Amino acid sequence: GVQVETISPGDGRTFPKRGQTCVVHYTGMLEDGKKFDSSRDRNKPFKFMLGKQEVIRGWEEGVAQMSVGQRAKLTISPDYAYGATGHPGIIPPHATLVFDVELLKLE
Numbered sequence: 001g002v003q004v005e006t007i008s009p010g011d012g013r014t015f016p017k018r019g020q021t022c023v024v025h026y027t028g029m030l031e032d033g034k035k036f037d038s039s040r041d042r043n044k045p046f047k048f049m050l051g052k053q054e055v056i057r058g059w060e061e062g063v064a065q066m067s068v069g070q071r072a073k074l075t076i077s078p079d080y081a082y083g084a085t086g087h088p089g090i091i092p093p094h095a096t097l098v099f100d101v102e103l104l105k106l107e
């Protein structure tokens with residue numbers, strides 16, 4: 001599933017609701033720890049609507065547990081990410097994914 005390990009705490013009271021747009025900054029890594037993507041390096045937060053299934057299951061469920069302001073490490077097993085298929089061109093089959101995600105704002 002998805003594990004959430006806090007880096008820096010959020011407000012502990014404002015949690016994303018389905019239908020809201022989560023605004024975040026993230027870095028993604030495979031098990032070797034190497035960065036394969038980063039919104040921070042583009043200096044532009046990434047946005048997604050919780051519940052629209054436009055991000056992997058680990059992200060919908062992991063970010064849903066965070067509060068605004070929280071920065072956490074999300075460790076996602078393959079079944080909650082790309083499974084046996086992977087995402088051709090960047091994530092191989094059977095990949096556990098680790099993301100550093102900071103929930104910046106809700107819109």
Ligand SMILES: CCOC(=O)[C@H](Cc1ccccc1)NC(=O)[C@@H]1CSCCN1S(=O)(=O)c1ccc(C)cc1
Nearest residue numbers: 026028037046053054055056057059087089090097
């Ligand atoms: C039910 C499935 O939804 C999705 O697999 C998506 C769709 C998407 C891919 C790249 C950029 C934006 C949106 N990606 C991710 O959920 C995940 C987490 S959210 C950040 C994006 N990425 S990722 O960082 O793991 C990734 C980066 C680049 C590529 C090309 C593919 C995946």
